[PDB]
Amino acid sequence: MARWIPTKRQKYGVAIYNYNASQDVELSLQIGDTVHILEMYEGWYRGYTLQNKSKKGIFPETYIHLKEATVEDLGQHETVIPGELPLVQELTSTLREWAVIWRKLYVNNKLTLFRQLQQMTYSLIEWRSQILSGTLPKDELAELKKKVTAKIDHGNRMLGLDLVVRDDNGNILDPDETSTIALFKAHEVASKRIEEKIQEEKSILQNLDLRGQSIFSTIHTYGLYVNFKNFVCNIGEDAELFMALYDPDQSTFISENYLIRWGSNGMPKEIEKLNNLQAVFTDLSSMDLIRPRVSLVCQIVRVGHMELKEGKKHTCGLRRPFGVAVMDITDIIHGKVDDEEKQHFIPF
Amino acid sequence: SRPILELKEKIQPEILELIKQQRLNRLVEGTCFRKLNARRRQDKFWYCRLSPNHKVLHYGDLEESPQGEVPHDSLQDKLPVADIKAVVTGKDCPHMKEKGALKQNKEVLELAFSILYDSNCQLNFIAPDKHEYCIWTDGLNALLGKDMMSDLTRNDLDTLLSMEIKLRLLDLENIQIPDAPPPIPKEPSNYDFVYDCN
Amino acid sequence: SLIGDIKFQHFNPVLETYIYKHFSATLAYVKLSKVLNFYVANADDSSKTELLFAALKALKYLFRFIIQSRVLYLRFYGQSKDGDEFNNSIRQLFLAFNMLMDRPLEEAVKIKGAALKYLPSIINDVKLVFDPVELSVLFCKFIQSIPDNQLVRQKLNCMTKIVESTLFRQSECREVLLPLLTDQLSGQLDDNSNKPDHEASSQLLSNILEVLDRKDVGATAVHIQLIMERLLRRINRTVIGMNRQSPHIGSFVACMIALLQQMDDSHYSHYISTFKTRQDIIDFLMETFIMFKDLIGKNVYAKDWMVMNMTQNRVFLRAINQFAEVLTRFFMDQASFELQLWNNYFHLAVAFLTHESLQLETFSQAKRNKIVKKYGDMRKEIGFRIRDMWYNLGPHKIKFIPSMVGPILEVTLTPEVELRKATIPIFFDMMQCEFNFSGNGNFHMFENELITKLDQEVEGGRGDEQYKVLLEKLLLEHCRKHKYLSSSGEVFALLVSSLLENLLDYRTIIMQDESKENRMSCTVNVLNFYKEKKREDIYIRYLYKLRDLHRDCENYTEAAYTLLLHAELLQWSDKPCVPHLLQRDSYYVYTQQELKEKLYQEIISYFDKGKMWEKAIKLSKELAETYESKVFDYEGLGNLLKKRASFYENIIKAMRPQPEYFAVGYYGQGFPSFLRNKIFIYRGKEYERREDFSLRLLTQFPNAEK
């Protein structure tokens, strides 16, 4: 234990598994035991373990990962992307305080926020592990930066904790005490986010998860999916008319509504139709027609399918002789008359 | 995750101790308990509240309190646990083995736990359903310095310990975790600190 | 509003400006548009030909000033210089501003007045050439609408949009523009019309300070000095006038903070400290200090904003440090006398130092490190400042010790080791001063308030064991350095140590045990402590504490017997000899007579309801005797003798139980210092069963054996 030299290339002195206690200092070291080392040797780094920063621990290099990185990650170009890795270090600190959050949340039962906390912290670690790799496009990184700081200060909110500023480039360049009225306006922006988020979290999390399908009280348009179809066919013309009129009554943040339909005769799909694009809409009314050509003799059995499109499947619709509860009526009304346009009411 | 789970199962100390200390608090906070065989103008709600010193239980025959527990000195204020044998569970109840008029219902078989003491008398309690029955059996076996026997205990145990490992894998990510024990290359013999300590 | 980018890219038409010619004599269009604006002054034709161009014609002139103007002046007018005529044409535009928008119009002056000072700021930014003529026409815009007393907060918005841009070519515009800014803010100071423009002036002061701060845009030191010298008194008087907490006071305190941070000592001390006669600068520093203290105590933010709160703390450090430099170099012995605004200064000092301590310093194990790296241990600097100040005030402390020992323990009590380590010896400073005043008295005047305040604070729950050891060490060491009066200080430090020991025992037991019996034993222990050490007023304070414990346990007999331990001290006389006998629950005159009258009435009531009538009689006799021989309140004798008759009737008539007496031997050593190996012969209760009592005394301790 001689030739010990100061260094600063040891900020990430990282273990592997339970280290063994051949020396009196060490114990069964956990997975993530960073060591703020103060002395250097060829294959053995003894330095301040984070668990007890006043107790030395002597640790082999074959247990340490050589990590030249500092808390700053742009000096050595260590940022896999510039201006971000400050986020990962502050997220690790925020998890280090999530340590005591879980440690103390059991002595007493506030289990509702804790269940949604299990959900939200699973989500948080999910985003962190995604952003471990820099394969994401930069706009994904900006959005992830925003949402990570949102979760962090939302935790700081319900715990009665301090606040965070400079929602960009690592939450650093504003809190670096560079000015003061920029500081006051940033604090006002952040606490306005607090007020917005507290009112909205109260509103959704309490009323809008109960004001809905479970409670008979009046609500807005939600996941009771309602869409209207107008199917026509003429015997002589041997053509098929299809009105994707309008599909109102959509659910939460109904993304990029668009509609589809296939002309399917068997397992493979023969023909398809394309319709225009529009943005987020609760009540979207394209009312567009594309006509597939099928004759009466082949009209006895086909696959008339349609599906509202968001990015996640809202539902599926398949109107054909082997129908179910709410499309047999439209089947009978479409087959009874071959001339007029009949508007139908149907859930999926 | 074989070395990971081996680490997880190797380090018990903190996790189960603190669980039992929350369980002590659960016994302390108290609730409305249940008696035996109340049909002819007999009460059905009472309390057996632990001391904040976690040694003695205040209990006895109490009233119909819609709010819950009544803080005061009750009928039977002592339950000494320096000498308790055990708390039998299942069909080992000298009160559930009645053969005359105090026979117990079959559907309430999952409320069975008897704090046996004095080797001749019994204090026999009844729970509403399974979960908090297992909660008080957690408390009871925690009064013995032994293992826990609750469904809630296994659920919390797994989520907690998995989370703790999950909250430990932070500094290793992007890099694999070797399982083979890394060597111990030789060291200098002298304690000569070239760099000053502290 | 809805397209957003591309047709909006046509809205700022780089397509039109760079694709097309734009090489015409559009200055004719400029003059004729001046005509359009002014000569068409009318009801409806004007109301459209003006109001439908918010800026858009001159918003195209925004790009014109280069692409049309300069290119026509270069390709075509490069040898036929014209670049100064438009100064004449647009200054006649300005003349028809002056006249028409001030003198003859008188209806749309509300609307046009709001709408034509809306224009120019929009269209003057890109016009950066001819920066002297900019200065001239801008001060002319200052001249034009010296308005009637309507604060429609629109001219201020024009000031905002003026100071926003064009301040990159700052060295010319800033100093020629600020005069009207400062004049109108000073008008906003007090004219019984602040309320419309509080928000406007907040927005203003904020944006002006933010743009001034900008590091590379333009040099600002001397202009910061003139901002200093013509606005600090007015903004501190703004928080005089906006002193209410309900308004957007936060924004103004923020502007105050930014202004106070940006200037330095070389900026501060020159002239705000060097104004007129001393009384009216004393009033200024009094205003400044008391409003720093009223902002710091009862803080203005939401106590969740650690960052800005600490920044406010640091800028207030700078402000108090500069305004303390001025105090040192102006109001010390250099000044004549009346140096008791240092009272306000130290009040603010301590009130500043009494938050951001180890609780929310340690809430995370790295919170201490965060705040001591970024902002440093602020408390350490505040304390070191206060200690050097207490070494500085020098010979004239004696005029200030008895009023100041109170708040200084609020810094000595601070947990952190170094701050304390530096802070203690000021007590020896006070005893040194009073030794120099020992010709008439001793340092008991310090010692008395030290004991009182130390008691209230320690019982409050601040000190600790390290605190007592360090206080003992430091105080003894300091009082080794001085004459025999400091040997007396040594023994009195021994007294202080014992007081700390007893109070910390009480302190741990009160909350560690929760057994009213142990509460009672320990509080009676400290009561006996004060009785032996003879500190009457605190003795009474804890005596009423004991009475509170009993009255909530309704040990009526014991509550009364204690209250009588109080009432014994008093006398039946007339003059209130000592004012210390007034409780904190109510405090006014009460000569001794009516005090014991209330005391004995309550004591009798307690003994009455507590079924101990022999004593209640024995005291009603003393009442009646003093009444009918000293005050002749014969209604008092009436109802009093009535009550005594009831007492005697009760003693004979009914019958009351006999308490059972046990005898408890708390044997062993694992017991505290006061219960160890001696028998407590508990009085019991009416029909207590030895099992019940030994059960309760099982509950009183761990290790319930027999």
Swiss-Prot record, chain B:
The modification Phosphotyrosine is found at Y191. Phosphorylated by HCK. Signal peptide: none annotated. Residues 26-147 form the PH domain. Involved in cytoskeletal rearrangements required for phagocytosis of apoptotic cells and cell motility. Acts in association with DOCK1 and CRK. Was initially proposed to be required in complex with DOCK1 to activate Rac Rho small GTPases. May enhance the guanine nucleotide exchange factor (GEF) activity of DOCK1. It comes from the Eukaryota. Transmembrane segments: none annotated. Interacts with ADGRB1. Interacts directly with the SH3-domain of DOCK1 via its SH3-binding site. Part of a complex with DOCK1 and RAC1. Part of a complex with DOCK1 and CRK isoform CRK-II. Interacts with PLEKHG6. Interacts with HCK (via SH3 domain). Interacts with ADGRB3. Interacts with DOCK5. It is found in: Cytoplasm; Cell membrane. A motif (SH3-binding) lies at residues 178-185. The chain holds residues 530 to 727 of 727 of the full protein. Widely expressed, with a higher expression in the spleen and placenta. This is Engulfment and cell motility protein 1.
UniProtKB/Swiss-Prot annotation, chain C:
GO terms for molecular function: GTPase activator activity; guanyl-nucleotide exchange factor activity; small GTPase binding. It comes from the Eukaryota. Keywords: Acetylation, Cell junction, Cell membrane, Cell projection, Cytoplasm, Guanine-nucleotide releasing factor, Membrane, Phosphoprotein, SH3 domain. GO terms for cellular component: anchoring junction; cell projection; cytoplasm; cytosol; plasma membrane; podosome. The modification N6-acetyllysine is found at K117. Its main location: cytoplasm. One of its GO terms (biological process) is bone remodeling. It is found in: Cytoplasm; Cell membrane; Cell projection, Podosome. Belongs to the DOCK family. Guanine nucleotide exchange factor (GEF) for Rho and Rac. GEF proteins activate small GTPases by exchanging bound GDP for free GTP. Along with DOCK1, mediates CRK/CRKL regulation of epithelial and endothelial cell spreading and migration on type IV collagen. Interacts with CRK and CRKL. Interacts (via N-terminus) with tensin TNS3 (via N-terminus); the interaction increases DOCK5 guanine nucleotide exchange activity towards Rac. Interacts with ELMO1. The DOCKER domain may mediate some GEF activity. This is Dedicator of cytokinesis protein 5.
